[PDB]
Amino acid sequence: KREHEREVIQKAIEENNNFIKMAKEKLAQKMESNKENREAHLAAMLERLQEKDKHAEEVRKNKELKE
Amino acid sequence: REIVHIQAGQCGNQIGAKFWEVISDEHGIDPTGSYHGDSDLQLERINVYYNEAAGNKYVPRAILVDLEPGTMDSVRSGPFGQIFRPDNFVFGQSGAGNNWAKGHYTEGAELVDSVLDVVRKESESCDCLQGFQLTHSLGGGTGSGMGTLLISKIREEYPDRIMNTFSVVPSPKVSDTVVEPYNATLSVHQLVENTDETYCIDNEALYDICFRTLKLTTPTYGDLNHLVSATMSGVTTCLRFPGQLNADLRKLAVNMVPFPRLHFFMPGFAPLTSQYRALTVPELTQQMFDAKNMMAACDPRHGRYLTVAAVFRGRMSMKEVDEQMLNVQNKNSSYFVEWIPNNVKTAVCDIPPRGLKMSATFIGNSTAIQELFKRISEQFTAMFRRKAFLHWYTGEGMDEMEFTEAESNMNDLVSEYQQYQDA
Ligand SMILES: Nc1nc2c(ncn2[C@@H]2O[C@H](COP(=O)(O)OP(=O)(O)O)[C@@H](O)[C@H]2O)c(=O)[nH]1
Ligand SMILES: [Ca+2]
Ligand SMILES: [Mg+2]
């Protein structure tokens, strides 16, 4: 019985630690994945905008090399 | 000689305190621990329950245990609260949340060692310890879970001593939580293995007595405990005063327990009170055997008596007592098993309890006690078949298997009581 008593309380400790661990790792995975997604969204927007600045240069050249 | 008393949890400590109030008054011990009685019969076996300290002070051999302080602060402020040894108060802070697993495996385990230190110090100075009595409920967490843990640890360290409980069985009629049947089934499993004698004090019966018989429309814990304390005074009379019959815990066990697992007793008391009319010996005798006077809600006509102890208190004719005890046995012979001859024993003590000229206490080992276990078993199953409320227990590390095993063992106890009833 004493050995069963010790296994019950270790099982409880083990499950609580495991809950804390899994919640800590899930949160860290979500926050990473969210950071990367947001940054990829912003980087695509900037990249469309840089392509506009590039195209505006081709316009001023077309006009220069027209004359 | 010496008995060590332990009271655990809210219920255990409330009924425990009343027990000490009632017996300290019977022995002439006041709240300071001074003897101011009128009769040498009061002091002759005083050492069974009280240590003697310097100044002719009598101190209960009593240990007070809980996982929360509240009820023990209330004990200390109660009328006799100063009589207890201060070092014998052993309390945690956490509570057990009506959760047997907290009492037995997590919170209780943390505290149990400090309780055993006090048990050992009381035991060490006993001339010849006979054993232990524990007061507790089975429906909560501390008395039920931690109480049965204590019993198991006490047995491991005093394996040749007698273990006796006053165990309060839960009822929906006087109920605190839905999980009581779980806590009681888990506890009964422990009691079946690790006590020698258990007085089944059923809250169902106490309630029905207060309501039906005493006409109390709304019974409180105080009204239930008035019955418990009169019963406890009655069933320990033979331990506490000079006498022939059942004078120590082992001799009572030997007279009462024909098979080791069947050690669950149905107590009774007469007259029932919460009044001036003299009660005759015939009337005490009929009323003490009446279903309505039993503290376990079991119909004794639905089973048979394996053994009975009857204790009469007060000045009365011993001839008349013998005749009436013989009369109930002779007219109701079919309710007493024929294969244990002369299975009813009678004691008479001259000192009556407070406020009565005459009283009788009944202790029955009846196969009808199976009704109590079946009632608990049905309430257990109704929940357990849907695993309802189990997460309270599995969160403390317990598996379902432990619930299945406890239920199976209590169903076996029921089948055994049924076997001897049909024999
Ligand atoms: N007869 C009686 N029953 C009680 C008392 N207090 C609680 N109970 C019962 O005891 C059970 C609850 O356990 P309790 O002792 O409060 O919990 P614990 O402190 O964790 O042991 C329920 O079945 C209640 O009906 C009391 O003073 N007298
Ligand atoms: Ca702790
Ligand atoms: Mg309570």
UniProtKB/Swiss-Prot annotation, chain A:
Residues 1-67 form a coiled coil. Residues 50-67 are annotated as: Disordered. This is Stathmin-4. Exhibits microtubule-destabilizing activity. It comes from the Eukaryota. Belongs to the stathmin family. The lineage of its organism: Eukaryota, Metazoa, Chordata, Craniata, Vertebrata. The chain holds residues 119 to 185 of 189 of the full protein. Nervous tissue. It is found in: Golgi apparatus; Cell projection, Growth cone; Cell projection, Axon.
Swiss-Prot record, chain B:
The modification Phosphothreonine is found at residues 280, 285. The modification N6-succinyllysine is found at residue 57. GO terms for molecular function: GTP binding; GTPase activity; metal ion binding; structural constituent of cytoskeleton. Pfam families: Tubulin, Tubulin_C. The keyword Protein transport does not apply. It comes from the Eukaryota. SUPFAM superfamilies: Tubulin C-terminal domain-like, Tubulin nucleotide-binding domain-like. GTP binds at residues 10, 68, 137, 141-143, 203, 225. Its cofactor is Mg(2+). One of its GO terms (cellular component) is microtubule. The modification Omega-N-methylarginine is found at residue 313. Gene3D superfamilies: Helix hairpin bin, Tubulin/FtsZ, C-terminal domain, Tubulin/FtsZ, GTPase domain. The modification Phosphoserine is found at residues 39, 171. A motif (MREI motif) lies at residues 1-3. Some glutamate residues at the C-terminus are polyglycylated, resulting in polyglycine chains on the gamma-carboxyl group. Glycylation is mainly limited to tubulin incorporated into axonemes (cilia and flagella) whereas glutamylation is prevalent in neuronal cells, centrioles, axonemes, and the mitotic spindle. Both modifications can coexist on the same protein on adjacent residues, and lowering polyglycylation levels increases polyglutamylation, and reciprocally. Cilia and flagella glycylation is required for their stability and maintenance. Flagella glycylation controls sperm motility. Some glutamate residues at the C-terminus are polyglutamylated, resulting in polyglutamate chains on the gamma-carboxyl group. Polyglutamylation plays a key role in microtubule severing by spastin (SPAST). SPAST preferentially recognizes and acts on microtubules decorated with short polyglutamate tails: severing activity by SPAST increases as the number of glutamates per tubulin rises from one to eight, but decreases beyond this glutamylation threshold. The keyword Protein transport does not apply. InterPro entries: Beta-tubulin_BS, Beta_tubulin, Tub_FtsZ_C, Tubulin, Tubulin/FtsZ-like_C, Tubulin/FtsZ_2-layer-sand-dom, Tubulin/FtsZ_GTPase_sf, Tubulin_C. Tubulin is the major constituent of microtubules, a cylinder consisting of laterally associated linear protofilaments composed of alpha- and beta-tubulin heterodimers. Microtubules grow by the addition of GTP-tubulin dimers to the microtubule end, where a stabilizing cap forms. Below the cap, tubulin dimers are in GDP-bound state, owing to GTPase activity of alpha-tubulin. Belongs to the tubulin family. The MREI motif is common among all beta-tubulin isoforms and may be critical for tubulin autoregulation. This is Tubulin beta chain.
